[PDB]
């Protein structure tokens, strides 16, 4: 976020960009092709699908090739966990079963 980027030095941003590029290279080199995103699956998998609630007014978010969900606030969607994990991590969505 921009409010946090203003805390960083320019050289710190350069280091962070180099680290991001190197990490992306490493993840890309793991598999036969398309790599493995080891940023995903940060917690052990329980259910294949989860129910999520929109916290922010995001735009649209694709789930299949031709299909997308409108992430309007207070709407609830039942979607794959591996698709929703990053948005939940970033606070766009809320996992709503406990």
């Amino acid at each position: 976020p921009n409010a946090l980027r203003f805390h960083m030095a320019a050289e710190e941003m350069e280091w962070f960009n180099n680290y991001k590029r190197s990490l992306a290279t490493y993840m890309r080199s793991l598999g036969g092709d398309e790599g493995l995103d080891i940023t995903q699956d940060m917690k052990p998998p329980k259910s294949l699908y989860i129910e999520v609630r929109c916290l922010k007014d995001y735009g649209e978010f694709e789930v299949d090739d031709g299909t997308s969900v409108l992430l309007k606030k207070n709407s609830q969607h039942f979607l794959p966990r591996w698709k929703c994990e990053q948005l939940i991590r970033q606070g766009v969505l809320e996992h709503i079963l406990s």
Binding site: L48, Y49, E51, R53, V63, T67, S68, V69, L70, K72, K73, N74, S75, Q76, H77, F78, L79, I96, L97, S98
Partner: protein, 534 residues
């Protein structure tokens, strides 16, 4: 067209598809949504759920989502209007409509391709035949047929009312799928109890639906249980109760329950100064100490409680309250969690219609929907506290109206108006809470007045809604006789008055008998209503 088999022609269709739920803001709608959510989550149906509080936001949500979804489900909305004209859909969408509102619009009934009604055919339905409604001496008979059409269709569209609970419909679907969990049966019970609490159905129909639900309760109570093998205290137990009509009486004092229940408050006239002595006479006739009666029910002495229901009935019979009992249900789980269906209804309803300004109405919908799951018992108990506050505010408002004589008999109908800035008007600004207030106030008025004429009239109530646009919410209520069939004409009377006066009437709520009206036009609107009802 009516769906004959929910399993074959609705569920097995939408099971393979992305689906969009439009859900109305009422407890029966919430319960049906919970049941349908549970089925979809069992089958991994990738649904999206949108709350809608009215027609315009339903149209907005449909405009937002119509590109991405081909199958839509409307819960407690859509059946009583021409959905094709309202939404202007593409030629190949499908609208499944599970809605209690009656009469079903004739276009919805006789549309055979796009609108699919999840409505039981054995409901109180009398649809006019297709040839009576749809297409020199020949053109003379054409005009005569058109006149007969206007007559018949007015006779059909006159009286609005409610049919079988959508939660019960979805539970019958769950039963046919044999994925009916005990919490789904509880949600069905809560939907029917929402209908009963809000007086949307007759007592005969409520007793019949309770008779239906009793058999499901027995089946669930013998799935893994009998008189000698019993389950953990963790498991949920639903029990049939011939319980008391008092509201929330297991969660606050019996005194507060008797004071804030609509029936006993109306009978004892507790708005009046003299009514408290009538209530004290009732309690002395029972033989309950006032300290125990004012103590919280869970802290009351247990020697007073194990025959309290029949004691209440026996004293009520000789006080003239001949029906203090009611056929209802309760749910137990764990050691201490116990709720009547009425308790869950009032808690969820208060979470929906909360007076809190923070967040929004959709956030309050979300709170109410969360509170129906047992992972959010804290939300349910918070809703119970809000329900106590709401009931107290209701009685204070009724007392203000009756003491100030705001209820004035406008010939064909009684009339009342809330005033801006007076206490709790912001709590009652929302149409559902306003409808409940008007019903409770009409019962209180009918018990208060001594005139035989006034005991038979309907009531129209107004309240402020907007100052940025200067409008009021107006509701119409039928008479409160025990002979009443719970049908009212105000949905059509309001629009006849509005078109006769060319008034700025806006029609956003799903019930036709609730409208928004410019504050200036209420005078001529009321004049037209007196002229119309005659």
């Amino acid at each position: 067209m009516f769906v004959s088999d929910f399993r074959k022609e609705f569920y097995e269709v939408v099971q393979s598809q992305r689906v969009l739920l439009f859900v109305a803001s009422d407890v029966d709608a919430l319960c049906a949504c919970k049941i349908l959510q549970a089925l979809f989550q069992c089958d991994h149906v990738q649904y999206t759920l949108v709350p809608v509080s009215g027609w315009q936001e339903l149209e907005t949500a449909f405009l937002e989502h119509k590109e991405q979804f081909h199958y839509f489900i409307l819960i407690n909305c859509g059946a009583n209007v021409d959905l094709l004209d309202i939404l202007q859909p593409d030629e190949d969408t499908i609208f499944f409509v599970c809605d209690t509102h009656r009469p079903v619009n004739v276009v919805n009934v006789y549309n055979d391709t796009q609108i699919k009604l999840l409505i039981k055919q054995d409901d109180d339905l009398e649809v006019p035949a297709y040839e009576d409604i749809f297409r020199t001496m020949r053109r003379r008979q054409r005009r005569e047929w058109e006149a007969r059409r206007r007559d018949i269709l007015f006779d059909y569209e006159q009286y609005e009312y409610h049919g079988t609970s959508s939660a019960m419909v979805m539970f019958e679907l769950a039963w046919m799928l044999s994925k009916d969990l005990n919490d789904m049966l509880w949600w069905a019970i809560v939907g029917l109890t929402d209908q009963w609490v809000q007086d949307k159905i007759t007592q005969m129909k409520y007793v019949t639906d309770v008779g239906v639900l009793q058999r499901h309760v027995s089946r669930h109570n013998h799935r893994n249980e009998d008189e000698e093998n019993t389950l953990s205290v963790d498991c949920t137990r639903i029990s049939f109760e011939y319980d008391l009509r008092l509201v929330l009486y297991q969660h606050w004092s019996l005194h507060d329950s008797l004071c804030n229940t609509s029936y006993t408050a109306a009978r004892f006239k507790l708005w009046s100064v003299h009514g408290q002595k009538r209530l004290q006479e009732f309690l002395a006739d029972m033989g309950l100490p006032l300290k125990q009666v004012k103590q919280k029910f869970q802290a009351m002495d247990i020697s007073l409680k194990e025959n309290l229901r029949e004691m209440i009935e026996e004293s009520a019979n000789k006080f003239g309250m001949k029906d203090m009992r009611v056929q209802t249900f309760s749910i137990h789980f764990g050691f201490k969690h116990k709720f009547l269906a009425s308790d869950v209804v009032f808690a969820t309803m208060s979470l929906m219609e909360s007076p809190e300004k923070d967040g929004s109405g959709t956030d309050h919908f979300i709170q109410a929907l969360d509170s129906l799951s047992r992972s959010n018992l804290d939300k349910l108990y918070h809703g119970l506290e809000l329900a106590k506050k709401q009931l107290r505010a209701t009685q204070q408002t009724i007392a203000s109206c009756l003491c100030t004589n705001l209820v004035i008999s406008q010939g064909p109908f009684l009339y009342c108006s809330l005033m801006e800035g007076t206490p709790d008007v912001m709590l009652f600004s929302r149409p559902a809470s306003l409808s409940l207030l008007s019903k409770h106030l009409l019962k209180s008025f009918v018990c208060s007045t001594k005139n035989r004429r006034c005991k038979l009239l309907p009531l129209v109530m107004a309240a402020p809604l907007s100052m940025e646009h200067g409008t009021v919410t107006v509701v119409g209520i039928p008479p409160e006789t025990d002979s009443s069939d719970r049908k009212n004409f105000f949905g059509r009377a309001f629009e006849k008055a509005a078109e006769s006066t060319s008034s700025r009437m806006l029609h956003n709520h799903f019930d036709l008998s609730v409208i928004e009206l410019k504050a200036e036009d209420r005078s001529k609107f009321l004049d037209a209503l007196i002229s119309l009802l005659s």
